Structures are given as structure tokens and as C-alpha cells.
Amino acid sequence: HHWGYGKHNGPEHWHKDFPIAKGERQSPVDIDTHTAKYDPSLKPLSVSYDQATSLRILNHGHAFNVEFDDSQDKAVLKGGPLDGTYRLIQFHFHWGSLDGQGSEHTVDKKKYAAELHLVHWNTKYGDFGKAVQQPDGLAVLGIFLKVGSAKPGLQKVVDVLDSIKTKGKSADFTNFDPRGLLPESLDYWTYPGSLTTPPLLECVTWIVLKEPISVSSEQVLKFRKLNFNGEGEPEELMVDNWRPAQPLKNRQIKASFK
Ligand SMILES: [Zn+2]
């Protein structure tokens, strides 16, 4: 027995094993566009992914991660509300069983078909493990996905999903350029939050892009064919692996645009 997204081990149950689930800076949250404050002091985001080195893709049971080599400053995020350099370590998604749900963050209560998370850690802390124990340890770039036209740069990812259908499976995944997953504009909203899966540590500085990217129905359909279960176990489709919006509490959401 362990956490998951089912009726008996879902988000509503996590607080029992991870008390911080009821914390003061939990994520995701609903972004109220009319209450978010424009902050002129916010610097533009600086994304340097030209030297990114992807290594592998694996199904860990709650989603699939594309891992990158983070032994050097190859793919980094700087600027915006960030102080220092943050290295990209992995990216993953959160999707639904239907196109009307799947994203973790919501905009004026609107849900998107999926949400992409690019996770980076503050180099000042030496490694990811130490970074998660700090309030400014991680920076996660959130991108919404809506169903429409196909996204060319995403196809490489969808075509290998068949090789990592079940929990525990991994496959070599080299030379993937994450730049093909970014929208045209880099305008964003930002707020202090947490990881959206256990251990739910409150070490994240969220950067949610205003502009979603479009993916085709066929592309998202392939995501839905993945399994939560391991090989040789009853098939349980990997869908709705998203956590519901949490109370904003004592926090303010800032916007880089007005
Ligand atoms: Zn995530």
C-alpha cells in the first residue's frame, strides 16, 4: 500500500502519510487572473536549453520522467523571480481521462487537458537532494496543454511511450531538445509553492506560463495508454494523475505582464 491517485490512496488520503499536505504553501492553486498583481520589478525569464543532454525516460508509476544530465550547467533557467542558477533535472506531465481535465493549476477555474512540469534545482545547494530541503531550492516551469493542432516537438516523446508502458520500465532517450515544448511567449505568473506529489515539500518557486501549447487528440491519447501498474499486474490506466487545487492561504500570485 502507498500513495497514488485512486479512490483509496488518492490526494485526499496523502495527508496521513505526509502531514505537510495540509501545509501553508501547498500546490497547485487556482490562478485568479484578476487578483494576481502585476509586478514591474519582475525580470524576464532566461531559458538556456541549447546544451541540454537528455538521458533516459522512465515510468515510475505516477507519471513518466524525461531525465537530463545535471552534472553541469548545460540546461539552465535564470532570471524572472529567481536569484541564482537552476539546472534542469527532469520534466513530466499531468493529464486526465478526458480533454476537460488534467492540469494541476487552473486559470480562473479553467482546467486544461494536461500540464507539463520542467523541474530545476538551485545550483547553490550542490544536488537535487539538498535543494528540496530549502525554501528556494527548486524552480518548476509549468506549461498548460490544450487539445488542437499537433505539437511537432512532442512526437519523439509519444512514440517511445510503448516501450515504458508499465511501472519500472525505462529506455534510453538521448538528444531530445526540450525547446520544442515551449510556447511563443514567456509571460508568466509566479508564487511560492510545493511539489504536487509526495513528499510535497514546500521548496518550489512556481513559474506558470500564460500561453498554453497545443497538442493533438492523438498525441494525448497515447499518454492515456500508459499503466500505473507494473508488468504482470492487473491493468490500471495511467489517467487523472493530477492533484486538485489547494488553498492559496497567506500568498500572493504575481504576474510578469499587465
Ligand atoms: Zn508535476
Curated annotation (Swiss-Prot):
Annotated phenotype, changing T196 to A/C/H/P: Strongly reduced activity
Modified positions (Phosphoserine) in chain numbering: S163, S170
Effect of E104 to A/Q: Strongly reduced CO(2) hydrase activity
Keyword Ion transport: no
Keywords per UniProt: Acetylation, Cell membrane, Cytoplasm, Disease variant, Lyase, Membrane, Metal-binding, Osteopetrosis, Phosphoprotein, Zinc
Site (Involved in the binding of some activators, including histamine and L-histidine): Q90
Impact when changing N65Q: 2-fold decrease in enzyme efficiency, as determined by kcat/KM ratio, and efficiently inhibited by chlorzolamide
Effect of H62A: Reduced CO(2) hydrase activity, rescued by 4-methylimidazole (4-MI). Reduced proton transfer. Enhanced proton transfer. Enhanced proton transfer capacity
Mutagenesis / variant outcome for changing L195A: Reduced CO(2) hydrase activity
Record note on what altering H62W does: Impaired activity, rescued by 4-methylimidazole (4-MI). Impaired activity, not rescued by 4-methylimidazole (4-MI)
Effect of V119 to K/R: Strongly reduced CO(2) hydrase and p-nitrophenyl acetate esterase activities
Positions contributing to Zn(2+) binding: H92, H94, H117
Outcome of swapping V140G: Weakly impaired activity
CC cofactor: Zn(2+); Co(2+)
Active site: H62
Cofactor note: Zinc. Can also use cobalt(II) with lower efficiency, but not copper(II), nickel(II) and manganese(II).
Enzyme category, top tier: lyase
Record's function text: Catalyzes the reversible hydration of carbon dioxide. Can also hydrate cyanamide to urea. Stimulates the chloride-bicarbonate exchange activity of SLC26A6. Essential for bone resorption and osteoclast differentiation. Involved in the regulation of fluid secretion into the anterior chamber of the eye. Contributes to intracellular pH regulation in the duodenal upper villous epithelium during proton-coupled peptide absorption.
Subunit and partners: Interacts with SLC4A4. Interaction with SLC4A7 regulates SLC4A7 transporter activity. Interacts with SLC26A6 isoform 4 (via C-terminus cytoplasmic domain).
Designated name of the protein: Carbonic anhydrase 2
Biological source species: Homo sapiens (Human)
